[PDB]
Design a binder for this molecule. Structure first.
Ligand SMILES: CCCCCCCCCCCC(=O)OC[C@H](COP(=O)(O)OCC[N+](C)(C)C)OC(=O)CCCCCCCCCCC
Ligand SMILES: CCCCCCCCCCCC(=O)OC[C@H](COP(=O)(O)OCC[N+](C)(C)C)OC(=O)CCCCCCCCCCC
Ligand SMILES: CCCCCCCCCCCC(=O)OC[C@H](COP(=O)(O)OCC[N+](C)(C)C)OC(=O)CCCCCCCCCCC
Ligand SMILES: CCCCCCCCCCCC(=O)OC[C@H](COP(=O)(O)OCC[N+](C)(C)C)OC(=O)CCCCCCCCCCC
Ligand SMILES: CCCCCCCCCCCC(=O)OC[C@H](COP(=O)(O)OCC[N+](C)(C)C)OC(=O)CCCCCCCCCCC
Ligand SMILES: CCCCCCCCCCCC(=O)OC[C@H](COP(=O)(O)OCC[N+](C)(C)C)OC(=O)CCCCCCCCCCC
Ligand SMILES: CCCCCCCCCCCC(=O)OC[C@H](COP(=O)(O)OCC[N+](C)(C)C)OC(=O)CCCCCCCCCCC
Ligand SMILES: CCCCCCCCCCCC(=O)OC[C@H](COP(=O)(O)OCC[N+](C)(C)C)OC(=O)CCCCCCCCCCC
Ligand SMILES: CCCCCCCCCC(=O)OC[C@H](COP(=O)(O)OCC[N+](C)(C)C)OC(=O)CCCCCCCCC
Ligand SMILES: CCCCCCCCCC(=O)OC[C@H](COP(=O)(O)OCC[N+](C)(C)C)OC(=O)CCCCCCCCC
Ligand SMILES: CCCCCCCCCC(=O)OC[C@H](COP(=O)(O)OCC[N+](C)(C)C)OC(=O)CCCCCCCCC
Ligand SMILES: CCCCCCCCCC(=O)OC[C@H](COP(=O)(O)OCC[N+](C)(C)C)OC(=O)CCCCCCCCC
Ligand SMILES: CCCCCC(=O)OC[C@H](COP(=O)(O)OCC[N+](C)(C)C)OC(=O)CCCCC
Ligand SMILES: CCCCCC(=O)OC[C@H](COP(=O)(O)OCC[N+](C)(C)C)OC(=O)CCCCC
Ligand SMILES: CCCCCC(=O)OC[C@H](COP(=O)(O)OCC[N+](C)(C)C)OC(=O)CCCCC
Ligand SMILES: CCCCCC(=O)OC[C@H](COP(=O)(O)OCC[N+](C)(C)C)OC(=O)CCCCC
Ligand SMILES: CCCCCCCCCC
Ligand SMILES: CCCCCCCCCC
Ligand SMILES: [Cu+2]
Ligand SMILES: [Cu+2]
Ligand SMILES: [Cu+2]
Lengths: 382, 236, 241, 123, 51, 236, 52
């Protein structure tokens, strides 16, 4: 819900999310929904964004309407920040547990230490039930099971109220007598030395000694109880395992790319060379969370968000099968209302008019090839 | 008569209006207020921004102009009892200023904090920003200017010169509003981290310090209270 | 003027209550702005309440307003609760926002978004000022105590959140699991300025070293802000602006 | 000149130096970019230059070689992930206006000192 | 590298996406001069009025 | 007589000398002046540096010594008409100082800018540096010192004490010349970028600010002008 | 490995071995872009003749 405002070229060339899947579209309270997919770190990472040396796999959502039970990059849990390598493709998996009823737009996002949020596609997930039914149990290494919704809440309230009461008692003790104007007049007109006299000093000594003694006793008691404590666990985690993708058998060279101002379409001319031994066909163009599909070649079945999915938004001038070894140049047009709804047309406002995306090529048997394209995007006005 | 029930209204108007504002932002925070380019955002928060800016400008102009036009020309022939009554009215103005300062610089400011740490900010005019920067800050600025003008135009102690502590207390917290330019600039550009303690926010901090001039302002009001009707009793 | 001695007393009492309201809530606004924009992120999150950065920063930036308000209130009225009133106002504003916005507007649990405790430090600062009225002695000893007692004062609250948990193959504290589970879309984990370990971290010294550094810097900041408050008390009449 | 005229007129009217520092400096900061827009607007016409999109000013900087001034030294807007919508120029203008208020306030007193007519008896 | 000729013969034409061809040697020079002279004249008029 | 034609010479000498210097650097900027290790660089710019440094030292010594030796011992028995004439001569000195300050701190300084942004600087003594740091800066320093000495030795107002604004106006711009050490150091070492706004250049900025003491200096000269021959007319 | 365990004054002792830089280098430690092969010892009780 935080994208459509970021720069179009920055959304195009940071991170490409694909193979996204959602386990469920509608859940109950305490029910789990799992989000899977892959993201590729673009080679032409913008210089204004710091390299993803420190990155965190986050969830885009309006507060804890879900709780993040687990999150994985590769196959290993990532509760801390992680290091990503430019040009690598990683697979991710986020497990969410429903907490608050309603209709929520859930995004998978990557926060980069020096570049800000990179928001992936968002999907509407319905939560039904009552928040009062939500439980977040956890078992500690000390052998006790607690609910994270209310654990330590009573202790926190008690201690804060106790110290607030001590401070209020001090202030009220001094506030029983007249406060501002008579004391000001006494201090000004001659030496005061009358508004602070025993047993006021004795009361202050008692307050100070009691404060120190209570702090020490409370610390000792909180050490006898909970004798086993550990510091906060933090630190960027290295050695994220990237996907070992096979080398693509399709090479694509972008010969100019244009978009009409104003308009809802993007046009580019591609020289596609088919290696390997199977006839390929262009089935998809993904630019920034928007999938332009050639419906005659490929159809989406993973429940991709409709406002981000162009079922027939990809038109190829000659999308006949490309025989192996054969090279041809075609005009590819990606047109959909999403191009203007998600403000991908506002790249005219950007200080770097370059686009990047993913082309998905499909053969007859159905196996697909992913190739990455990037080129300057030239607006056309007449 | 002396202190009248204008203090009750001074507390209640801010309390009720800001409770309604909190209800409004609780209802329209999500669901017309998350997406800054949705049409419903324009009808529920951009319209709110426009209406509140126009109403704040009109109210500030009317209130300040009325206070300045009804200024007491013959301050010399003011009885001590009337001076005491005017001092109490000025204290009511200061109470209203303190209440508005609380609502602006504590409640809605840390509400801006809890909004931005949990959503991805979509514009310079998030609902939180509309409520905090452009409603509560102008409201407390208007109240502070009105209190300063009332002191200058009704209290002989605060007449015959501009009180430095009062001017600081009134203008420093006002400088937080133009400081929003630093907030937006150092957030879009410098610092994409939501860090609430980022130096891009020290503009609020520095001019929040100037509210400490309330100490000198209040000792000045104490002296103004204790001019003719200082007692006796006190120091007797 | 005033009719009699009794009416003067009643007028003074009414002025006392109204001026206490004004002082308290102007301090609440200004002090809360300063605190939340100088220590707010650590104060917001239990998984930010660490032993190095939280313990270091919070007393240093929070001793500011108590020093100024003390330098005014004690000097002009012999009222030894400037630090206490500052800390109480900050705690009131913080708790109101935590309950009605952090837990009210958003639905973060209170045990996740509770603020830190500061009353022990405030009480030390106030009593050390009233006894031995020396402002220098206060800045040296009371600010030392204010810095040193911060972490022990908050330990009863945060200690239960530091119980170790075996969470999906990784060791995590309860506060760590809270930060992991309750998603902060705008606050990724790397923003967390917490103790991460160094090659020059010798033994079990992280908390005491941070506490002593905070106490020394608190001495310095108290010394500066005593004179800042001295200036802010000026009753001058700047003839023209 | 537009900013200077605003600063001078706002000072002469309402002789308050504080009012000048607040309002006139605000205007001085805000009117800078609109004042220069008639000059630089023709240089921002887009050009398709050898496969890449470039403004006329970009082509000027590219063509007219500055041996001592490579392109990376250029501290210009490059885009951020927190740049929301079409806000770059107004946000910068308002930040400049606020900082102009601050700098004007400081330099009023700096000039007050520089006016001193004191006779430092010995150096 | 030896260059022969006259600097006056140099041209730097460029065609914009708006369909106009301009010479980068002198494009916008007149507009820049005009606006700068206009604002300088306004300031000088203010100063002379007070002078 | 009063104001005589020494003002015309004061303007013309700087104008003509600096026009010739500009012609010289236009002729020998390229082509004996690009390569700092070429033999022609030594004959056209290193020799220029040596000659200009020697001549500046000699001229400063002679001018300052003459002005100090011909100082007026009997300032008390100075008629108001002669005081007015000496005030006009001091104003001519200040005009020469302002002209030299312009030529040094604006023309040749931004000329140094346009030289360094377009060539690769080869030494600490590029032709631009020779003209700006070691010719124009010493020239305006000499003029400022001479004006200060003339004021102190001929004007009773500027006698009996060292005027703080005049001392600042005279010495601060002088401090730009030793600041060249920071320019060279932070350029060879700190900062290899030609950035004209680099903090290595804030030494010129800080001591360029001290030229604002001309305001206090000029109100002092106005008072010195209006001592005996203040009028009447003015304020009458 | 250590060439000798007990040496005379002016006698040479050689220390050899291998070190592997761990892939999971902690983020709190800067990457070993600038590293120095040093000897841990209580002052110059030995002099470093050579290091490779
Ligand atoms: C110092 C001077 C301050 C000046 C600024 C004041 C700002 C006022 C609010 C702006 C509203 C806006 O701009 O929006 C207009 C809103 C948009 O809601 P709607 O879509 O019509 O839904 C129906 C309306 N509900 C959602 C509120 C039910 O509707 C309105 O007409 C209602 C606005 C009521 C404001 C007055 C009540 C305040 C509480 C009572 C104690 C005072
Ligand atoms: C106390 C201060 C009160 C000031 C009230 C505001 C007066 C506005 C005058 C019209 C300006 C205009 O219309 O132009 C401003 C342009 C709009 O730009 P745009 O929308 O991107 O595109 C151009 C669209 N046009 C062609 C239709 C204009 O620049 C800006 O972005 C700046 C907008 C931010 C204004 C912030 C004001 C906050 C006030 C808070 C009061 C409590
Ligand atoms: C009443 C007077 C008598 C008491 C005197 C107390 C002397 C010190 C006690 C050390 C406790 C301990 O145990 O050592 C220190 C414990 C940790 O201990 P460890 O983990 O075992 O450290 C392993 C290494 N050792 C075995 C050598 C200790 O924490 C600390 O690093 C505290 C460090 C504080 C640094 C800043 C101090 C500034 C002082 C300013 C004074 C105005
Ligand atoms: C005027 C002076 C008043 C001083 C009041 C002291 C009250 C008692 C504190 C016990 C602390 C403790 O138990 O040990 C140190 C622990 C930290 O331990 P950790 O290793 O980080 O592990 C954390 C987990 N625990 C608690 C299960 C082990 O707490 C602190 O960070 C406090 C550091 C400041 C100590 C100040 C006393 C030293 C002398 C001061 C005068 C120069
Ligand atoms: C006379 C009184 C009534 C007028 C009140 C004006 C209110 C604001 C108008 C916004 C114009 C607009 O259009 O929005 C803002 C336009 C861009 O617009 P966009 O590209 O559509 O932004 C897309 C997102 N949206 C649809 C939600 C707008 O520029 C800006 O980001 C300006 C940002 C300025 C930040 C600093 C302001 C400091 C104010 C200090 C006060 C003392
Ligand atoms: C005392 C207050 C005086 C204010 C005078 C304003 C004159 C009109 C300016 C129109 C600007 C415009 O047209 O919109 C905004 C544009 C930038 O637009 P951009 O999106 O970056 O694109 C650039 C390309 N353009 C031009 C083809 C779209 O210009 C600016 O950067 C000006 C920003 C400051 C606006 C100040 C007015 C808001 C209220 C101020 C009081 C709080
Ligand atoms: C405040 C006290 C300032 C003191 C410093 C003054 C510096 C003077 C210049 C240094 C020259 C140098 O050093 O170089 C010596 C130059 C090197 O040129 P050349 O190879 O002989 O070619 C032939 C000469 N042309 C190229 C000039 C034609 O030749 C000379 O003899 C000529 C120097 C003439 C300087 C006097 C004229 C100035 C303009 C008229 C108004 C005053
Ligand atoms: C107002 C100030 C006037 C000062 C005039 C200069 C007096 C020089 C005395 C002789 C020094 C010497 O000869 O030695 C300086 C050595 C030369 O070193 P070298 O060439 O690398 O090698 C050694 C070569 N020998 C063995 C032949 C010397 O160190 C330096 O590099 C410093 C040189 C920079 C001097 C900058 C002076 C700028 C003055 C500007 C006046 C307007
Ligand atoms: C050389 C530095 C060593 C430390 C001394 C610094 C204290 C100096 C403070 C000062 O200037 O004097 C203020 C008061 C004066 O009160 P007196 O009327 O002198 O009271 C004397 C009786 N008494 C011992 C109970 C205090 O006297 C006091 O401040 C209190 C004196 C008692 C010392 C303990 C008080 C501090 C408690 C934490
Ligand atoms: C962020 C920093 C904190 C701000 C505190 C700085 C205050 C500086 C003191 C000051 O303002 O001096 C006022 C003089 C004008 O003097 P006058 O108006 O002649 O008043 C006569 C008495 N007096 C000279 C002692 C003032 O100088 C003037 O020209 C008037 C300017 C007054 C502006 C002060 C308002 C500050 C609000 C932010
Ligand atoms: C509470 C803050 C709200 C804004 C008010 C700040 C202005 C204060 C300036 C000040 O101290 O007074 C200086 C002059 C005094 O001139 P007066 O002789 O009072 O003239 C009154 C008639 N007039 C309305 C045409 C001005 O009066 C003026 O400065 C001009 C007053 C007219 C307001 C508009 C002037 C500014 C134009 C941009
Ligand atoms: C970059 C910072 C800007 C520079 C502005 C700083 C000016 C500081 C004021 C100052 O210089 O004080 C002079 C006193 C010597 O006093 P005296 O020569 O006894 O003069 C009697 C009258 N007076 C005490 C008020 C000066 O102190 C002395 O010992 C004489 C030193 C005078 C040096 C001032 C010249 C500054 C030129 C850069
Ligand atoms: C001193 C500041 C008091 C702030 C209290 C506040 O924010 O109240 C809103 C919150 C809203 O939660 P709730 O009471 O459950 O009502 C929800 C209504 N909305 C969502 C519109 C806020 O609770 C109340 O309205 C209690 C009334 C307190 C009167 C001083
Ligand atoms: C009064 C203390 C001010 C200290 C300033 C500070 O903490 O800045 C951190 C920042 C370091 O940037 P970093 O924290 O790495 O920011 C990471 C996020 N990005 C890269 C988007 C800015 O440094 C600067 O850019 C210069 C600040 C000048 C202050 C007048
Ligand atoms: C108020 C500062 C005036 C600076 C003018 C200047 O730098 O002039 C040099 C420039 C040189 O260009 P140009 O006139 O074509 O003659 C070239 C001769 N060289 C190359 C030696 C400069 O033009 C002139 O000589 C015009 C005379 C103006 C008299 C105030
Ligand atoms: C009054 C503002 C001063 C701000 C200083 C500044 O901008 O420094 C930038 C520079 C950052 O270096 P950078 O701009 O990356 O320089 C790139 C070129 N090299 C690496 C050759 C220096 O930081 C420093 O080295 C410390 C400056 C101390 C100032 C007292
Ligand atoms: C950094 C603290 C400086 C506080 C300024 C106080 C000045 C008082 C002058 C009366
Ligand atoms: C940073 C601005 C400080 C200016 C100094 C002015 C001092 C005036 C003393 C008479
Ligand atoms: Cu969304
Ligand atoms: Cu990619
Ligand atoms: Cu290893």
């Amino acid at each position: 819900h935080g994208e459509k405002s970021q720069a179009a070229f920055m959304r195009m060339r940071t991170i490409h999310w694909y193979d996204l899947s959602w386990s469920k579209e509608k859940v109950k309270i305490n029910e789990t929904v799992e989000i899977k997919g892959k993201f590729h770190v673009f080679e032409g990472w913008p210089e204004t964004v710091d390299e993803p040396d420190v990155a965190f796999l986050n969830v885009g959502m309006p507060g804890p309407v879900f709780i993040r039970k687990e999150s994985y990059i590769g196959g290993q849990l990532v509760p801390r920040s992680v290091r990503l390598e430019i040009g690598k493709t990683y697979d991710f998996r986020v497990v969410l547990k429903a907490r608050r009823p309603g209709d929520w737009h859930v995004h998978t996002m990557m926060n980069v230490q020096g570049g800000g949020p990179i928001i992936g596609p968002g999907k509407w997930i319905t939560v039904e039930g009552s928040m009062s039914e939500f439980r977040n149990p956890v078992t500690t290494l000390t052998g006790q099971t607690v609910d994270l919704e209310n654990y330590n809440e009573g202790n926190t309230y008690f201690w804060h109220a106790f110290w607030f009461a001590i401070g209020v008692a001090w202030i009220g003790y001094w506030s029983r007598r007249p406060i501002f104007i008579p004391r000001l007049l006494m201090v000004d007109a001659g030496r005061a030395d009358e508004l602070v006299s025993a047993t006021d000093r004795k009361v202050a000594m008692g307050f100070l000694a009691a404060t120190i003694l209570i702090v020490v006793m409370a610390m000792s008691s909180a050490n006898s109880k909970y004798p086993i404590t550990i510091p906060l666990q933090a630190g960027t985690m290295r050695g994220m395992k990237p996907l070992e993708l096979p080398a693509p058998t399709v090479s694509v060279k972008v010969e100019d790319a244009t978009y009409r101002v104003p308009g809802r379409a993007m046009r580019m001319k591609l020289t596609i060379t088919n290696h390997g031994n199977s006839p390929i066909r262009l089935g998809e163009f993904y630019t920034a969370s928007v999938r332009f599909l050639d419906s005659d070649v490929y159809k989406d079945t993973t429940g991709y968000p409709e406002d981000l999915l162009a079922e027939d938004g990809l038109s190829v001038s000659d999308n006949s099968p490309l025989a192996p070894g054969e090279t041809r140049t075609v005009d590819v047009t990606a047109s959909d209302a999403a191009w203007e709804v998600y403000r991908l047309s506002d790249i005219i406002y950007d200080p770097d008019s370059r686009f990047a995306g993913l082309l998905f090529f499909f053969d007859a048997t159905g196996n697909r090839q992913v190739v990455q394209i990037d080129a300057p995007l030239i607006p056309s006005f007449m | 008569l002396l202190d009248k029930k204008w203090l009750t209204f001074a507390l209640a108007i801010y309390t009720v209006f800001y409770l309604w504002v909190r209800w409004y932002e609780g209802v329209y925070g999500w669901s017309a207020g998350l997406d800054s380019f949705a049409p419903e955002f324009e009808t529920y928060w951009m319209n709110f921004l426009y209406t509140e800016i126009v109403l704040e400008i009109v109210t500030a102009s009317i209130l300040w102009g009325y206070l300045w036009k009804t200024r007491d020309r013959n301050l010399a022939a003011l009885t001590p009892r009337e001076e005491l009554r005017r001092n109490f009215t000025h204290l009511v103005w200061l109470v209203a200023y303190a209440w508005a300062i609380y609502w602006g610089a504590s409640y809605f400011t840390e509400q801006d904090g809890t909004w931005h740490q949990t959503i991805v900010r979509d514009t310079d005019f998030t609902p939180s920003h509309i409520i905090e920067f452009y409603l509560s800050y102008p409201i407390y600025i208007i109240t502070g200017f009105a209190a300063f003008i009332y002191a200058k135009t009704r209290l002989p102690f605060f007449a015959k010169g501009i009180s430095l502590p009062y001017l600081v207390l009134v203008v420093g917290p006002f400088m937080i509003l133009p400081n929003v330019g630093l907030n937006e600039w150092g957030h879009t550009f410098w610092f994409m981290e939501e860090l609430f303690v980022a130096p891009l926010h020290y503009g609020f901090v520095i001019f929040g310090w100037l509210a400490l001039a309330v100490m000198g302002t209040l000792t000045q009001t104490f002296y103004s209270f204790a001019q003719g009707g200082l007692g006796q009793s006190l120091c007797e | 003027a005033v009719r009699s001695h009794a009416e003067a007393v009643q007028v003074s009492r009414t002025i006392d209550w109204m001026a206490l309201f004004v002082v308290f809530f102007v301090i609440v606004g200004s002090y809360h702005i300063h605190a939340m924009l100088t220590m707010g992120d650590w104060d917001f999150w239990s998984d930010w309440k660490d032993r190095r950065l939280w313990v270091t920063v919070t007393p240093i930036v929070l001793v500011t307003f108590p020093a100024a308000v003390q330098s005014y209130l004690w000097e002009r009225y012999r009222l030894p609760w400037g630090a206490t009133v500052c800390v109480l106002g900050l705690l009131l504003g913080e708790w109101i926002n935590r309950y009605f916005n952090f837990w009210g507007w958003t639905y973060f649990p209170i045990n996740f978004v509770f603020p830190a405790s500061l009353v022990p430090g405030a009480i030390i600062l106030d009593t050390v000022l009233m006894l031995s009225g020396s402002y220098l002695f206060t800045a040296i000893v009371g600010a030392m105590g204010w810095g040193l007692i911060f972490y022990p004062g908050n330990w009863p609250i945060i200690a239960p959140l530091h119980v170790p948990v075996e969470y999906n193959g990784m060791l995590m504290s309860i506060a760590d699991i809270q930060g992991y589970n309750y998603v902060r879309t705008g606050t990724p984990e790397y923003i967390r300025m917490v103790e991460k370990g160094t090659l020059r971290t010798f033994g079990k010294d992280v908390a005491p070293v941070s506490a002593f550094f905070s106490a020394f810097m608190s001495i310095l900041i108290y010394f500066m802000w005593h004179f800042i408050g001295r200036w802010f008390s000026n009753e001058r009449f700047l003839q023209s602006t």
